[PDB]
Structure formats: C-alpha cells, structure tokens
C-alpha cells in the first residue's frame, strides 16, 4: 500500500506527573516523590520544555490528531505492512535542526534522516538536517527481512531524530513504528487484537536535552545556585518514566477482561537503563515462550501478548530496584466488561500446601573464610576479597544477621524439614515452591522477625486479596496479605492456570522466584528470596523431581547490598566495635557490605553443586537488584541448551529467570562464575563437580579430524584511534565543538596509544613468520586470529608466549580433557587440545556457524583488558550437498569498553605516553575516565575499517561482548535489518549484548551507500563505540 503520515516537530512543556495524584506506590515516600518533582531555586521540578513529534491531517499542518492518553510524549504511531511505501511528510516547527530516522525499514541514503560521514553530498543531505521551519519528505519502504517467520504478526520498531541522537532523544523526539506482516491489518489494527499499546522505559535524562538552558532559566527560581554538575541536581533531572510518566502517572491503560492485548515495548537511553518491566498478576508470552519479566535496555525492541484477566487495577512496575523507588510505576486498569470466558476445566487439580517461616540467622558468606580458587584467607593484606570481608573499626566484614525463609513440616512451626543432600547448594535461598500446570499452590506463612513481611511470587495467579505487595488506590479491603505482622501468620492461595505455566515450545519446568513484598528495595537484599518452579501437567514426581531428570540446581546471582538490609542497623551494633564512627554514606563503607554472591556464597565456598558424568542436569537460574546486576553465569568446560540454542554463559538481570538443560560430558572440578569483571574480582565464582558414578572405560563417546593453528601472544603499540578526521567531520556536521575525555591528551593524560598484548597467528611452529592480515580480515583489529572448526574436529593450538608474563589460551563451547588450563611462561611454547563435539556447535534452532570467545585465563580480567581476546566459530559439518554459486562474507565484532586502568601494561603506559608522569594520580577519576576506551574490536570513531561488502552478499556478523557491568551494549545497523536463529526466523535491528553474549547475525545487504553501526547506549555513542560499514552496487 502507498501510505502517508503528516508529522510535525513542535516545541512544548511536558508534564511528567499530569495531576492529580496522590497515589500509593511501592517503596516510595513523598521525600522520593519530591526529589524529582520539587521545584526551584536549585531544581527544575516536574515540568520541562521538550521538542516532540505530532500528527496532522494535511501537509498544510493546520489541524492535528490527538495522540492517545497513554502515548504520553511519544510521537504518533506509524503502522506499516510488508512492501508498503510509507511517505512521512515532516515540518520542523521547533527552534533547531532535527530529523526523522526510521528503523525496521528500507531507505536510500537520502531518506535515512541522519547525519555522519557517509561520503554523501548535496542531494543526499536533505534527509540529514531539517533546519527550523523547513519541510521534508522521508520515503520508507517495508522491504527488509521484515517481520521474522517466528516473530509475531506485528513487531516494535521506533523512529527518532538523529542529529545528535542521544540529545535529540533526550529532547523528546522518539516514536513508534509498528511493523506488520503483509497483510495482518484491518483498518490500521491487527485482525483479532482488541488492544494495542506502546511503552518506553527511558530514564529520560532531561540534563542531556537541548532544553536545559531554556529549562533552568524558566523554572529554577534562583539560576546561579545551579551547578549543572551538582551530583544531586543532575539526578533531579532523571525522570524514571513510562512514556514520560513518572510515579504512577501514566493514564489511559484500560482493557476488558478476556481481551487479546498486544504490548509493544522498548528501552531507550543510557547505562542507567537496565529495565525489567513486570505486568503484575498477568499472563505473558514472547515468541511462544512464557515471559514473567520483559527486560529492556537502550533501543531493545520487543512485542508480547496478553489475555487480560483478573478485573481490578494492577501495577506495571519495573523491578530494577533503584528504578522502582525513583517511581518507575504505573497502573493499568483491567475492566470487567463481562465477556464470556473459555473455561477449561483442567482435569485432576492438585494442591501443593507449603509451610514456610521467615526467621533470622547469621550468614557467613564464607564458611571456610578462604578462597577455594586462590587458596588465600580472604583477609590477606592487599587482596581484592579483603575489602568485603575486612573487620574492625567501621567495617562489619564477613557475617550479617539476615532474615531468611525456611521450611516447616506443618501448621505448628515446631519441626523443620531439614536441608537434605542435594539441597546443600541452596544456601540463603528459601525452599523451592513447585507445582504443575492446573494446580493450586498454598503457602502458610509465619513471621519470626523484627519487621513486617509477606510473600510475593512471580508468574502465578493471585486474586487481589492474596497480593503480597501493597499499592493503590486499587480497592483492596484487607491489607493482611501484603503486611504480615512480626509474629503473625497468613495463608496464601495462588492458582497456576495454563497461561502462567510453560508453553508448547518452552522447557519442561520454568525458572521463577518468590520474595517478600513489603519493601522490595530492602526485603530481597535482607535474605527474603526463594526459588519457584512451575512445570507442565504430569511432568513431576510426587516427591517433586522432574520425571526424567537426575539432578536439579538453583542459582541466584545477585549483588547483596547489606547497605539496604532491614538489619544494617542491627549489624552495625552487632559487628562494628566503633559503631558511632560508622558513616552509612561513605563510599568505602558501602563497598564493605556489597556481597557479590551466588546463593549467598562467595569466593568458591558454595557446596552442593555435584553431579555424575552424563546425567540429565537441569539448572534453574535467576537474579534480582539494580543496574549493576548484569551478569554472565559461565560454566567452564560444559554447555547447555535452552529453547534450542547453545551457549555456556547465562546473561542475567533483575527478575530474569533462565531454565538450562545440560548433560555433562567431561569429568572434574569446573567453575560457575560471572564473567562481569567486578563480580569475579568481588567473589562471584563457585565450583561444580562431575564425578564418575559408574564410568567406565574413560571417554564415554566421540571425535573425527585434527587441525593446527599456530597462535602467539604479543605485545605492541595499539593506537585506539589513529585518525581523528571522522570524529572531526561528525562534530562539524552536528555543529558541536566538544573535546573528548578518552582521546584528547590534555596536560597530564594519555589519550589514544597504549601498550597491549594481542593474540596473533603464525605460520610454522618456529614463529619467525607472523601471518599477514588479509583484506577482509583487516576489520578484526585488536581481535586475535579467527579460528574456524567444524562439528567433529579437534583443534591443536600451538601457542607461543611472545610476551612478558604468564598468559594462556582457551575457548567457550570447546571441550578439553579435565578441569584445568595450563599457564604459558614468556618465551616458552605450548599445545592445547580443543575437542569440538556435538555439544560445541549449533543446536536444533541455532544457525550453523556460532561463535565463541577464546581469551587468556591466567588472570581472567587483567589479561582480557590487556588485549587478549579472539573469535572461535564452530560450524556444522554440512554435507555431501549443495554446489552451484553462493557468495558469502564474515565479520567478527567485539563490543568492549577496554578498562586500560586494569592493564598489566598500565605502569609502562603511563611512564611512556603522558606529558608529565608525576601528575598522574592513579585513583583520580578524571583519569579512570581517560583510560576507559569505548570500542568495537579495539577501535573508535570510524577507525574500524573494511567492513565492506556488496549488494546481494550473505553476511554473517559474529557479534560478541565482554567485560564489566558498564559493558551492556545494543547493536544497531543503519540501513539494514538482520535475522538470527537457524534459517532466519527472528528479525530485528538492534541486538542486545552483555558479557558472555555471542551471536550470529544473518544480514542480506541490498542498498548501496555507507552506513552507520553504533551501540545505542547514550554514553557509548558519545564515547566513540561507533563505525560505518559500506555496501556496494555489484
Ligand atoms: Ca543521508
Ligand atoms: Cu527500570
Ligand atoms: Cu535508533
Ligand atoms: Cu554499548
Ligand atoms: Cu537506525
Ligand atoms: Cu543511529
Ligand atoms: Na527535577
């Protein structure tokens, strides 16, 4: 279809609380409320000026069309079906240059709506910058791999200005392009959908807007008492919002019961935006998999379905805790329009009645007081583990009073039900609640604590009465469910109807959690968290095991803020011997009580994780917390399959829950750990053990071929950005001046060139000749040599250490002989046996070539940041089969903010490169900035080159990301979409990366021009994690 959309960039004042409330929110008092919505002299408050898209009838732009209540500040909705030509008529009524850049959709270089160096001119910059008053036509065609085969009828896509996109997004220009299949739409609305909504979780940083100057003068009553760097002031401008509606203010979300609702969600913003949206007491599914949470990061695109049940009014919170108490809340209002309900009638309805008590104890994050890994007493002088565990003056140290759930046999909470053999790993986790689809869970809860508590589950049904978090006004009579008094008892009825359990395509049993629901921002962190496990009808033994599985495990990787324990007070009394000197707001104090743990154990001390070779293992993982609970739970040595995909590493977030299926092949003592730099060094690393419980020769199956890459570790001047002309043209085009923290040399600072240790390939085993880097290998940079392998091989890596301290080399997915890597001393040279079984390459639903990282493992963290990272691709042994022409290209992309401050080569870096080596205060955080290098494949600001291809090629992009907590990255390709999974059943143009995420992205280029490739997180675009790839016209 040929479609037209009239959209105008007007300027206006946007109210982030739109009256008149005066609601009852979770973990929010009016002090919180005020921090953000008072209001000068030194505070802008609750209304700001923003530039916003608006819909009109004509290209006269003389009458408008009202944007629905619930849209808030978002531009109007552009629906497009496949092959439609959409003509977006724009008029810039605002006071500055803006644009209209679309996403899941095809456009020439003069319908992009975006401005960078792309080699373009004159006729192709009419898109790139609409000056004030100018009108423009943006021509869109719905002609990518548009929605996937396995994607649903319509998917979430966005549009926004791209002059300085963070600053244009901040300023209010952002809106939804819903993208549907040919031809799902009857009268602009998906056939057989009753309700269509769009939501944005933006932490909308109004400090970054173009309208701060205009906003401080207009709203701050005394504008020279306004240090724009006032830590506090800045944070007073961070509107934790849903369509720009902070604190429960989002209006217009009402739906009749039994309505089919599509929700078109997306993240937007910066490092701070680690969302975790929850639609309270409601049925969710994404791609015919159940989802309880919906995480969203910057520009994370995703749709979901819901049949709206349970008339009433419910919270749509985000359970990132720091987000939650900055009021990232809103309500949706499920009607009782009296539609007839299709009631099965699940036969044979079973009742799982549990007896749990909340009570007190001391933990003992380290029973052993040592590091099973390094061997050391955790408190040794200089150790990274000391900080957390140190005791005396104003440091609590190693043990904390915690409330924790525990199981009792019955009614009278008198006999326990003692922690059995395999339940040894649970630790701080409460007892597992479990059920089948159709059941009726009940939980008799008794409190034996100082404070009042509850049990809020995740992903079961509960009537209003049973809801264990309080909020309103929602019409609740009893507050008893939500508030249980420090020695009271309540019970506690949940149902588990079909829609809350796992689907057709889902695993057997879903990973879930239950927590205490009074004040989430303290009760979970206090120890009030247990695992839950809802399973398919009859998939469970009457004892509660999965019918065909040997061992089940549970893991809760969270960072335990004791800092917000209900009992911080109680602990400062009970364990500091200068309690009067305890400054609760002292950074260095706060650190002491951040127990980076798994099941509340640290530095190797988790018992229970024990299994025999080749057993059916089913791991259930979950997490909770805030934007520093990004995780990569990597099992060394073994891998798992989850919904037909193969990895070894679990990316976890607040209220995320993963079910992993594993059958473990190599025998030994292997490492569960968080790849996230800080969690490792801070003690998030445990052990599991595969034992020989019969055997019994010593190989239990297979291998075939044998390949020999000659690799070497060396040791070189790495410039991160040798030209600057790209950066220079960028900033000249946007008319910005800007100097750069990282790159500019300053007085005392480094800039761009740093000594690093890179992997390289060598020809013989003499290493006198280093392989020359090809021409379509030249895009790799800091990466080591590409390593191909096929489902069957073995890989000899012969590794010389042409470096100056012990390194190693090893790869994810890959298999070896038993649970150990060998170090490789300088000058010395060594061989590694990487086996490549069935469990190292694609799974059912994986596309055939899948990448992994190979990296040093002397010092996981310091080695990795120093330069030692590479790609290993593990392709399925194809065929006798097909012949006649293909064409094909490959690109490995590694997204990493390289912490040069962690380099072994830092000393030498500083001495060598800085103008004055004396002025370098190493803890200076002007400096910890200059040396955080934001880069794709070790290169920045268009100095990652020879991403080059031709129209009609078949490109596989091997994207990976490693590193810290800051290293969440969102990959966006301008011009083109892509697919993932085998064949290409899911399409998107933003792929979400964290440390331990590796994925093959199938792209089919088709448009001549030079196109941009950024991380969509605001800090990283601006830091220089960006480049272009060129597509050429045959
Ligand atoms: Ca352009
Ligand atoms: Cu959030
Ligand atoms: Cu974008
Ligand atoms: Cu990024
Ligand atoms: Cu784009
Ligand atoms: Cu962009
Ligand atoms: Na404010």
PDB file of N, CA and C and ligand atoms in Angstrom, residues 101-103 107 972-974 989, ligand 5:
ATOM      1  N   UNK A 101      14.416   9.549  11.484  1.00  0.00           N
ATOM      2  CA  UNK A 101      15.189   8.382  11.082  1.00  0.00           C
ATOM      3  C   UNK A 101      14.358   7.182  11.470  1.00  0.00           C
ATOM      4  N   UNK A 102      14.099   6.278  10.530  1.00  0.00           N
ATOM      5  CA  UNK A 102      13.300   5.091  10.839  1.00  0.00           C
ATOM      6  C   UNK A 102      14.189   3.856  11.145  1.00  0.00           C
ATOM      7  N   UNK A 103      13.576   2.731  11.547  1.00  0.00           N
ATOM      8  CA  UNK A 103      14.344   1.557  11.945  1.00  0.00           C
ATOM      9  C   UNK A 103      14.224   0.328  11.035  1.00  0.00           C
ATOM     10  N   UNK A 107      15.540   2.381   3.164  1.00  0.00           N
ATOM     11  CA  UNK A 107      15.600   3.754   2.704  1.00  0.00           C
ATOM     12  C   UNK A 107      16.900   4.041   1.969  1.00  0.00           C
ATOM     13  N   UNK A 972      23.144  -1.726  16.718  1.00  0.00           N
ATOM     14  CA  UNK A 972      22.255  -1.208  15.682  1.00  0.00           C
ATOM     15  C   UNK A 972      23.009  -0.894  14.405  1.00  0.00           C
ATOM     16  N   UNK A 973      22.463  -1.462  13.334  1.00  0.00           N
ATOM     17  CA  UNK A 973      22.960  -1.284  11.996  1.00  0.00           C
ATOM     18  C   UNK A 973      21.987  -0.339  11.307  1.00  0.00           C
ATOM     19  N   UNK A 974      22.530   0.759  10.793  1.00  0.00           N
ATOM     20  CA  UNK A 974      21.733   1.648   9.929  1.00  0.00           C
ATOM     21  C   UNK A 974      21.528   1.009   8.545  1.00  0.00           C
ATOM     22  N   UNK A 989      16.550  -4.954  14.355  1.00  0.00           N
ATOM     23  CA  UNK A 989      17.787  -4.189  14.006  1.00  0.00           C
ATOM     24  C   UNK A 989      18.516  -3.553  15.169  1.00  0.00           C
TER      25      UNK A 989
HETATM   26 CU1  LIG B   5      18.572   3.456  12.549  1.00  0.00          CU
END
